[PDB]
């Protein structure tokens, strides 16, 4: 303190996950299970509508509807697999109607 000439300089010191996380975790959740994804009653009414345009006054066995749902969902899951491959091939991540149309074009479904 008595330093008057050249003093001593020293001696002084809600949560929201990012987009894509829940989606991937949901993908893992549905790839592990095999339960049907489309609900049974709206699907059964839709098929009844389609059949009325083919032949009138028709009855369906419950097993017939379940078999229709099994083949339909398997076809759609496989189609989205091909659809996702097309979208990734176009340097994209998002599926678009052009991807499904391209997939069905390669399959020969016209």
């Amino acid at each position: 303190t008595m330093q008057t000439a050249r003093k001593s300089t020293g001696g002084k010191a809600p949560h929201r996950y990012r987009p894509g996380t829940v989606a991937l975790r949901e993908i893992r959740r549905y790839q592990k299970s095999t339960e049907l994804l489309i609900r049974k009653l709206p699907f059964q009414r839709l098929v009844r509508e389609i059949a009325q345009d083919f032949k009138t006054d028709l009855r369906f066995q419950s097993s017939a509807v379940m078999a229709l749902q099994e083949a339909s969902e398997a076809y759609l899951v496989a189609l989205f697999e091909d659809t996702n491959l097309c979208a990734i091939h176009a340097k994209r991540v998002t599926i678009m109607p052009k991807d499904i149309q391209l997939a069905r074009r390669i399959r020969g479904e016209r």
Binding site: R28, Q31, K32, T34, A74, I88, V93
Partner: protein, 53 residues
Amino acid sequence: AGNAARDNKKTRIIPRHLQLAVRNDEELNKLLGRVTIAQGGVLPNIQSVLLPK
């Protein structure tokens, strides 16, 4: 199928085990390539580009 049952730690074979068994084999998949197994599902598969950083 019995091997897949041991892996899933279940005594009785369910259609999931048949699906896993047929599709993991390279030749059984080609034989049943145009066949869908009821209550079978799909194999867990996520593309590389789709994985996070």
